[PDB]
Design a binder for this molecule. Structure first.
Ligand SMILES: COc1cc(/C=C(\C#N)C(=O)Nc2ccccc2O)ccc1O
Length: 328
């Protein structure tokens, strides 16, 4: 069978938390007043929710109302419980309220308002300092939720809100987030294709927080190299081949051999043999100002097949890449 895996950090956090903390199916939602919020305009319609700009008329403050699409109640309460567990954490989106929406007959999550700019728009103008700064801000959110026993499992630019005017960042859409329990096998059908960790693409279910670090690596690669997205697979199988053309097939086999994982036999005629590449090959005159030896070394240490070999969020925050970022 497959070799079990454990997170190398925050392994037992949910073990020594009270059951109330992670047993989200037993959570009791405290409903606010749905009439407190006047929807102003629709912002987006995802697979699991519609997001609206609204005003809390009890304080005349802009808020964001996320009306969930009809899904299993465990998944709704998972997100709610995770949001309430992480509330107040660094750069975690703040769940201000939960109301029962009378039209959808589904919970509407009310969040703080973040004056976001489009990441396609934003990532075109981000400076080298801007990238390191926001990466560090994402790392604060990731280390916090990991330290709280939760993996986001959907880290991608669309889930990173940035008010660039006030240099404000929020990690959002915790609808795929899960509590990490040692030895638990998780759904591999998480994260967007371009940001899926190799563990997902090889169907290894006993993953952990390190999944988010791969996704963060994919984001960093897309920014400093100005290639959106970096690993641009056409499906989940071609996705792994895209990664294997950069990280090499031999370390891929080392990875699946370490965990006694077997590749889908459909990889036999599409994977091929690929050397591991040096990150300098992706540097060119149009992105070189975003690249540094620290950037490449940091990226190198995030994008590792072996989830157990990736930098943890805290380790990533110690990296020389962030030495130039002004601390507070
Ligand atoms: C989808 O899941 C979540 C979404 C959010 C928040 C937003 C979204 N999407 C949001 O504020 N967007 C936005 C704001 C201002 C201008 C343009 C915008 O698109 C918060 C928590 C979630 O869980």
């Amino acid at each position: 069978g497959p070799v079990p895996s454990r997170a190398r950090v925050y392994t037992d956090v949910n073990t020594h938390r009270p059951r109330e903390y992670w047993d989200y199916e037993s959570h009791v939602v405290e409903w606010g007043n749905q009439d407190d919020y006047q929807l102003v305009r629709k912002l987006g319609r995802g697979k699991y929710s519609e997001v609206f700009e609204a005003i809390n008329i009890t304080n005349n403050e802009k808020v964001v109302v996320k009306i969930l699409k009809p899904v299993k109640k465990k998944k709704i309460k998972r997100e709610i419980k995770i949001l309430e567990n992480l509330r107040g954490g660094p750069n975690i989106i703040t769940l201000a309220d939960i109301v029962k929406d009378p039209v959808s007959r589904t919970p509407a999550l009310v969040f703080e308002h973040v004056n976001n700019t489009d990441f396609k728009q934003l990532y075109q103008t981000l400076t080298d300092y801007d990238i390191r700064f926001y990466m560090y801000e994402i790392l604060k959110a990731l280390d916090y939720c990991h330290s709280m026993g939760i993996m986001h499992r959907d880290v991608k630019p669309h889930n990173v809100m940035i008010d660039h005017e006030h240099r404000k960042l929020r990690l959002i859409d915790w609808g795929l987030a899960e509590f990490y329990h040692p030895g638990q096998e998780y759904n591999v059908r998480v994260a967007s294709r371009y940001f899926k960790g190799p563990e997902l693409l090889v169907d290894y279910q006993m993953y952990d927080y390190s999944l988010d670090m791969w996704s963060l690596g994919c984001m960093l690669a897309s920014m400093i190299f100005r290639k959106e997205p970096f690993f641009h697979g056409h499906d989940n199988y071609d996705q792994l081949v895209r990664i294997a053309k950069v990280l090499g097939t031999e370390d891929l086999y080392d990875y699946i051999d370490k965990y006694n994982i077997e590749l889908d036999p459909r990889f036999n005629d599409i994977l091929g043999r690929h050397s591991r590449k040096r990150w300098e090959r992706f540097v060119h005159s149009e992105n070189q100002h975003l690249v540094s030896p620290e950037a490449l070394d940091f990226l190198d240490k995030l994008l590792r097949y072996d989830h157990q070999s990736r930098l943890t969020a805290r380790e990533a925050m110690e990296h020389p890449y962030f030495y130039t970022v002004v601390k507070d």
